[PDB]
Amino acid sequence: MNTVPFTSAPIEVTIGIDQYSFNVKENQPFHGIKDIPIGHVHVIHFQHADNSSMRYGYWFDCRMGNFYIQYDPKDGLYKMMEERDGAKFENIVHNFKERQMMVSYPKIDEDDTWYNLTEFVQMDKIRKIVRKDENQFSYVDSSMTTVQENELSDPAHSLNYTVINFKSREAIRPGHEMEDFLDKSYYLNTVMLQGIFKNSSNYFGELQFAFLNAMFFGNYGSSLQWHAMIELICSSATVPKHMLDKLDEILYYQIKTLPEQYSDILLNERVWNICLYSSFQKNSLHNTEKIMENKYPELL
């Protein structure tokens, strides 16, 4: 079970670790997070107490290095860093653990929530969406725009989600205009799955990452990408049964985890109504349909 120490907590902040969160007071003797489950990506995230516009975090995998958090008083944020000296890192973690200055990743044994939300998410695909090749971890924040949003402006600080655009030459074969616009199967199966993603696992990984960035950072472009990737499948008459069954599980756990209070900002009425009640796949998402109708019947 891996550990992310913190040098200190000089400013009052809400710290998220995956779906959990806790409040740290200004100069509280907080020195990090232990017992982080090996075998999944994780996200550590921040929202400053004195400025809720500061909302940002780091995707990481403790299998790829020894990572810690240090506050930078010049740039005014908590930065992830990699410790290259294994012996120093072990000694720092040991001292803090002995002094009980770390919170424990509060995983209930029966609880697969985080696996369910990150099943297809891999750190190597994250590092291609978020381009900073000198670090093994990835910074995301609430204001980062997508390559798509930038087209419709700093290219280095952008989320390189796969561009999906239903009224584009990529989506529509000349000669098959009506066919391809009303049935997105060509665009999903040939262009996106066979061509760009190579397989459904990569497509679902990007969909899951987009949702998590929308939920944890309120990242608007991420929310757009998440909905576009659901709509592209729901709007396709021809989708492998395994992919529909898997999508129903993916969406069920995303809707289950979404805070009730953020449902008005995180859920697009048009896409969800279209996907559940009008689309080719309106009868293929039984679990997602049931949780949506029981949790968010006002949206529908």
């Binding site: 009224k167 584009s168 030459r169 529509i172 000349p174 205009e177 009506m178 616009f181 009303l182």
Partner: protein, 257 residues
């Protein structure tokens, strides 16, 4: 954005533009079957593609064979319209291609946008104008070429005849919309107004009669009288009692959506 009352003069500037009206593309008669069910029978239709500055009308005749063995015809009709407008644009030399295509019905926007992806600089716009282009098939020579067609055909017309020799495009378009609105409202009364003086004929090469400038003023009056008479009949309104600005705001509230 949307073409409305505010931006009407834009229709008569030197930027090539076309109106596309798809009302008459898919046309049916509805009848009882032997078993007492209901069936449709398609009849020949047309796409009404008009340059409002020049009067050039590209009348694509939609022959009933287009529909044979096809499903969801009202949906397909929009996409067939978009396919044919995009084929017409590709057929025109570059200097004749429109800068803008204004669709009379908002349901034509996505079909036309998708067919015109290869022309990202041609703007596809809706309009707030209520235009009576559905009444094209009340023009005897247009109805005749559509119904006689035995195969898909494009026929070119100037819907203003020679009017632009004497009047501006603004005035010609105003005259056309008034005539079509009158034909839409009461076809038989409108035709009787146009055809009643046997000494004024339609030239072989024209759609409308050969009225002098003074006769066009009389005809226009008679058409505005027909439209107001029919509004009174429809709403049970005493027209004789209305003021001149009441009358203005009915005749030209009917050509906004």
């Amino acid at each position: 954005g949307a073409m409305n009352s505010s931006n009407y003069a834009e229709l008569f500037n030197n930027d090539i533009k076309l109106f596309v009206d798809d009302t008459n593309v898919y046309r049916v008669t509805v009848h009882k079957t032997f078993e007492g069910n209901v069936a449709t029978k398609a009849i020949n239709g047309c796409i009404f593609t008009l340059n409002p500055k020049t009067g050039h009308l590209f009348l694509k005749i939609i022959h009933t064979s287009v529909w044979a063995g096809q499903k969801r015809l009202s949906q397909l009709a929009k996409w067939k319209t978009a396919e044919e407008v995009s084929a017409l644009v590709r057929s025109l030399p570059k200097e004749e291609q429109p800068k803008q295509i204004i669709v009379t019905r908002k349901a034509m926007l996505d079909p036309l946008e998708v067919h015109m992806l290869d022309f990202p600089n041609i703007a596809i716009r809706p309009t707030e104008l209520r235009l009576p282009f559905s009444a094209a098939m009340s023009i005897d020579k247009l109805s005749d070429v559509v119904m006689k067609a035995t195969e898909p055909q494009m026929v070119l017309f100037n819907i203003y005849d020679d009017w632009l020799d004497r009047i501006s495009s603004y005035t010609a378009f105003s005259r056309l919309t008034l005539l079509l609105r009158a034909l839409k409202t009461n076809e038989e009364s409108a035709k009787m107004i146009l055809l009643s003086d046997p000494t004024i004929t339609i030239k072989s090469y024209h759609l409308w009669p050969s009225f002098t400038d003074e006769q066009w003023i009389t005809i226009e009056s008679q058409m505005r009288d027909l439209i107001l008479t029919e509004y009174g009949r429809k709403y049970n309104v005493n027209i004789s009692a209305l003021t001149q600005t009441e009358i203005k705001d009915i005749i030209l509230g009917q050509n906004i959506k």
